Amino acid sequence: QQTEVELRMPSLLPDDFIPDVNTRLSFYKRIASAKTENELEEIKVELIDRFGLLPDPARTLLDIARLRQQAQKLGIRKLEGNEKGGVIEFAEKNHVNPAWLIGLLQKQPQHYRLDGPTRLKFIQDLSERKTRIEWVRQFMRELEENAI
Amino acid sequence: GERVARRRQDSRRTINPDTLIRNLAELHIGQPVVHLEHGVGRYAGMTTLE
Amino acid sequence: EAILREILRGGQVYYLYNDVENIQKAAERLAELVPEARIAIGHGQMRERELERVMNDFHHQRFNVLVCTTIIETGIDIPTANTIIIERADHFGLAQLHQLRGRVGRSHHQAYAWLLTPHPKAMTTDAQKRLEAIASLEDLGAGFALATHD
Amino acid sequence: KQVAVLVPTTLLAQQHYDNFRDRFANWPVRIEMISRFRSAKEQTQILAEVAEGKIDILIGTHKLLQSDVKFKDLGLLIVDEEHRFGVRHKERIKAMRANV
Amino acid sequence: SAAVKEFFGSSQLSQFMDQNNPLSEITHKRRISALGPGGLTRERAGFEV
Amino acid sequence: SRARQKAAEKVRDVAAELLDIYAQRAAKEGFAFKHDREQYQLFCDSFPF
Amino acid sequence: RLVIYEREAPEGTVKDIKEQEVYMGEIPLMTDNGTFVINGTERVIVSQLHRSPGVFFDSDKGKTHSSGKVLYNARIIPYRGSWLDFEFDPKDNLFVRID
DNA sequence: ACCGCTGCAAGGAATAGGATACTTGCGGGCTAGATGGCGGCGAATACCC
DNA sequence: GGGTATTCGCCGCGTACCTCTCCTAGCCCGCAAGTATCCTATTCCTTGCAGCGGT
RNA sequence: GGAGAGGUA
Numbered sequence: 081q082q083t084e085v086e087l088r089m090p091s092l093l094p095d096d097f098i099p100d101v102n103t104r105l106s107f108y109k110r111i112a113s114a115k116t117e118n119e120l121e122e123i124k125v126e127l128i129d130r131f132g133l134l135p136d137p138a139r140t141l142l143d144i145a146r147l148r149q150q151a152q153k154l155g156i157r158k159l160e161g162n163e164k165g166g167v168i169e170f171a172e173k174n175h176v177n178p179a180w181l182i183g184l185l186q187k188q189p190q191h192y193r194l195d196g197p198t199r200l201k202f203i204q205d206l207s208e209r210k211t212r213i214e215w216v217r218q219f220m221r222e223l224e225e226n227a228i
Numbered sequence: 229g230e231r232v233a234r235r236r237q238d239s240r241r242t243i244n245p246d247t248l249i250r251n252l253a254e255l256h257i258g259q260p261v262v263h264l265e266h267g268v269g270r271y272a273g274m275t276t277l278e
Numbered sequence: 279e280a281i282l283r284e285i286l287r288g289g290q291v292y293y294l295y296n297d298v299e300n301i302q303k304a305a306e307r308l309a310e311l312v313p314e315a316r317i318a319i320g321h322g323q324m325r326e327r328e329l330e331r332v333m334n335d336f337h338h339q340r341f342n343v344l345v346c347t348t349i350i351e352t353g354i355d356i357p358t359a360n361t362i363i364i365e366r367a368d369h370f371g372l373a374q375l376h377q378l379r380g381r382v383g384r385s386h387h388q389a390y391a392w393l394l395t396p397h398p399k400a401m402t403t404d405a406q407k408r409l410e411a412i413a414s415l416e417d418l419g420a421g422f423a424l425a426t427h428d
Numbered sequence: 429k430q431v432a433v434l435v436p437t438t439l440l441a442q443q444h445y446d447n448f449r450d451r452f453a454n455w456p457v458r459i460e461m462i463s464r465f466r467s468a469k470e471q472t473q474i475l476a477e478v479a480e481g482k483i484d485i486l487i488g489t490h491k492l493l494q495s496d497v498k499f500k501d502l503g504l505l506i507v508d509e510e511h512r513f514g515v516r517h518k519e520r521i522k523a524m525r526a527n528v
Numbered sequence: 529s530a531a532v533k534e535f536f537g538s539s540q541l542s543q544f545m546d547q548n549n550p551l552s553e554i555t556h557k558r559r560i561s562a563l564g565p566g567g568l569t570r571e572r573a574g575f576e577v
Numbered sequence: 578s579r580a581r582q583k584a585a586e587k588v589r590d591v592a593a594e595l596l597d598i599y600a601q602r603a604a605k606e607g608f609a610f611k612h613d614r615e616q617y618q619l620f621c622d623s624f625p626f
Numbered sequence: 627r628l629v630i631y632e633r634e635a636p637e638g639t640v641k642d643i644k645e646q647e648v649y650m651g652e653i654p655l656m657t658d659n660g661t662f663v664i665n666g667t668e669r670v671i672v673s674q675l676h677r678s679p680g681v682f683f684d685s686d687k688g689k690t691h692s693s694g695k696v697l698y699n700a701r702i703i704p705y706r707g708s709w710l711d712f713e714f715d716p717k718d719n720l721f722v723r724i725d
Numbered sequence: 726a727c728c729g730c731t732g733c734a735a736g737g738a739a740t741a742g743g744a745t746a747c748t749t750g751c752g753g754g755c756t757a758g759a760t761g762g763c764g765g766c767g768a769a770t771a772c773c774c
Numbered sequence: 775g776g777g778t779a780t781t782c783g784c785c786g787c788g789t790a791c792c793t794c795t796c797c798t799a800g801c802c803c804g805c806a807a808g809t810a811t812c813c814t815a816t817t818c819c820t821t822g823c824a825g826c827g828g829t
Numbered sequence: 830g831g832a833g834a835g836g837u838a
Contacts, residue, residue: 090585095592105593137586235325238741238817265642277643296808302633322438322809325740326465333439348749348808352437352509369807371749373511402751429608436747437809451623464811468738490747490810503608512809514747515591519598526598527607529651536654537664538796542671543834545661556835557660559672563834566676571787572762583803667795677761689763691780709760725760 082112085147085216087161089209091140097131111145120146136209143213147220154224157198161212165203174198177226280363280392281312281343290336290359291315291343292350292381296366298323304365305345316341322349351377360389367393368405372428375412376421429503430478432521433487436512438463444487444508452485462488462497493520502528540564679705691716 098104107123114120124142127134134142151159155176158169170176185192193201206212247262255261261271284291295304298321309317318341320332336344337356351374362382367375375393382389393409395401401409415424433448435441445461452459460483462474471491477483481500491497502525507518522528536542541564546552563570568577632641654662661668685698699713711723 088588090588092587092590093593094586095590101592101596104590105597108593231331232327234818235740240817242816298808299633326438327739329438330442330465333442349437349439351748351808352435352440352512354439354443369750374749374808404750429610454623455620494811503610512748515595517747517810519595522602523594523598526601527605532651532653536662536669536671538833539671540833541674542662542664542669544794545668545670546835547668553659553661556672557670560675561672562675564672564674566761567674568761574762577761580804665795669795703760 081152083148083151083157083159085144085151085159085161087144087166087206087209087212087216088163089140089212090137091144092137093141094135094137097135097138111141114145115149117146117149120149140209140213143217147216150220150224154220154227156220159216159220161206161216163206165201165206168200168202170198170200172198175227176223177228180226280361280390281315283390284361285314285342287360287387288358289342289361289387290339290356292359292362292378293317293343293345294348294350294362294364294378295345296347296370298347301345301347308343308345312343315343317343317345319345320349321347323347348374348378350381353377354381355384356381357385360385360387361391363392363394365394366396367409368395368401370408372408372412372424375408376424379412380421430481430483430499430501431485431504431506432492432499432502433485433506433508434492434513434521435487435489435508438465438489440509441465441487441489448485448487457485458483459485459487462486462491464489464491490517493517499525504528677703679703 093104093107095104098107107127110123111120114123120142124134127138147159151157155171155174156168157171158167160167160169185194191202191204195201204212204215206215255271257271257273259271260268262268281291281293293308295301297304301319301321305317305319309315318332318335320329320336322329332344333354335341339358348370360382362378364370364375364378370378379391382391393412395405395409398406411424411427433444435444441461441463442465445459448459460474460477462471466474474483474486475497478486479498479500486492486497486499488497505521505525505528507513510518541561546556562568562573562577627643627645629640630642630644632639635641654664656662657668661670681700681702683698683700685696688694688696690697693716695716697714697716699711702710708725713721713723715721
């Protein structure tokens with residue numbers, strides 16, 4: 081069920097955050113089985129209540145789960161990324177506006193190139209994990225508003 | 229049957245354009261040079277070595 | 279002497295070098311040291327339709343010595359091969375050394391195993407402790423005591 | 429129950445293929461090897477046969493863990509020479525089929 | 529650096545300078561020691577050397 | 578290519594993955610194979626030792 | 627100057643040859659006088675007086691075997707190598723030993 | 726004008742090369758931690774009867 | 775047997791005082807070797823088509 | 830606390 085939003089950055093629950101293994105595993109199940117951003121907010125508040133501050137791996141895990149939550153509804157089956165760019169692997173029937181997609185492709189041909197039927201390559205200097213995260217967030221947010 | 233050993237070389241003659249210059253050897257000192265194994269350097273003349 | 283002792287008996291030799299960059303020179307040099315032997319090279323970094331055919335020829339006795347990497351550490355049987363010669367055995371684990379020693383035998387013959395080393399002041403200390411342990415246990419069934427020592 | 433034999437090198441893959449094909453040479457059991465020694469056009473044929481459920485013993489190297497090798501009804505795994513694999517390689521198949 | 533600093537710093541012949549005269553310095557730089565590495569012992573030397 | 582760097586910090590956690598794999602293998606019950614006596618004795622007779 | 631010989635060509639042929647100025651060790655400098663500042667303390671390395679390599683004919687003057695006889699020997703002491711000792715037995719025999 | 730031949734061209738199959746993940750070892754950095762004594766003497770051989 | 779002789783290894787080698795320098799090894803990480811895989815260019819090989827010649 | 834060097838009687 082994980083339409084992976086792997087960005088080659090650590091997204092997990094660190095051992096110092098939650099010491100015992102079983103509570104970590106229970107929260108992994110709870111996060112990856114949650115289907116609404118309201119439920120992810122509930123999990124986040126429960127994490128903050130029972131363990132305090134959320135480290136960078138924990139916040140990356142939660143925002144990756146949120147990105148997957150939006151991507152499962154939209155229709156991106158494998159949104160990927162790295163330091164040099166990334167590949168959007170769509171579904172058989174995605175919900176991207178075609179005229180808008182061609183508009184993006186013609187306004188930035190160096191940052192959007194279709195390589196295959198459902199693979200769109202973007203090339204971006206995503207040197208920072210955070211900046212990559214809001215780049216993906218705004219990309220997908222501008223996608224979902226034009227979804228048909 | 230016998231050995232099907234035909235892997236002597238691959239055609240590396242591709243991508244040879246004006247850059248190669250057909251090895252005229254008229255380079256002047258300080259002219260930048262690419263050596264595809266190592267990278268970009270500055271040519272500094274002909275020398276003799278043992 | 280080891281290679282001639284195996285050739286005159288009719289068996290085959292593993293000669294493990296474990297360095298692909300210089301294996302073509304090690305085999306060419308060994309083919310001058312012992313001209314009576316027929317020598318091939320087998321490692322996992324040459325093309326598939328060549329390694330497969332070399333290791334097929336080795337089964338059918340088309341050559342005696344096969345200068346190999348540790349791709350033969352894994353359990354290749356070849357019952358006629360009864361002499362392994364590990365060229366520089368100081369940097370190998372106990373498990374790897376015993377596995378390499380296990381490739382000879384496999385039949386009613388008596389099989390030797392030479393672990394050539396550098397000058398013993400040039401080895402490290404862990405290499406000395408590993409070699410004095412692999413040479414300490416030479417018995418049938420010593421693969422479990424060696425494991426519970428490792 | 430579609431035995432799956434996992435060996436940590438291609439020479440072991442080939443030798444175990446030969447030994448298994450020698451032993452099961454009088455039974456209606458189909459034995460097949462998948463590794464880099466097989467081509468790129470017959471590897472997909474082997475995967476199609478296995479997923480269909482017609483190869484009953486599939487001897488392979490680390491190729492047997494690459495998430496595109498789907499067994500129909502896997503009932504036995506045989507990890508041979510396990511001291512060259514690592515933990516992730518040893519539960520990469522145990523995770524998919526839990527009770528193998 | 530180890531084999532050079534070990535000889536210069538702490539050896540039997542790389543020794544602390546006597547510096548209470550100009551004479552003491554200029555004659556300590558000109559000693560001819562029969563001891564040290566590759567040489568005889570301070571307390572196992574006979575009557576002849 | 579920045580090999581010197583120690584990358585990130587455990588890009589993944591293996592304690593939870595291995596614990597869940599073990600606790601799912603130890604939770605349910607595997608296949609109970611049915612053994613044939615005289616159909617396996619032929620396979621034993623194929624062994625030349 | 628690290629040479630590289632290529633594998634395909636016959637024995638002795640230079641594929642590449644690289645060169646760089648490598649830093650290896652800091653060596654102490656003698657001052658204007660003869661003194662070394664090693665850790666902030668001026669030290670002096672004293673000249674030694676040792677046995678020169680070569681050949682040395684010697685004898686033990688009637689102080690062995692209680693015979694009252696002198697036993698002449700001859701050492702060959704190389705700068706780098708194994709020494710070679712000849713010596714006389716108490717029966718006027720000539721005997722050789724190494725190390 | 727109709728058929729055989731050849732050069733060319735496209736299309737997929739090998740093939741290289743880089744990137745990633747296992748095993749093993751080993752060194753570097755930073756921090757817990759062998760050949761210049763000599764006398765005396767009693768015991769251990771080496772030997773000869 | 776069993777006494778003599780040669781050799782070998784331990785034990786020993788002055789008292790008191792003053793000044794100075796110099797005293798680190800082991801374990802974790804990142805490199806190397808091997809092995810395996812995927813992924814992406816890049817060359818290579820085979821077969822089918824357009825143009826030209828023989829009849 | 831120990832090694833190395835030098836010194837006084």
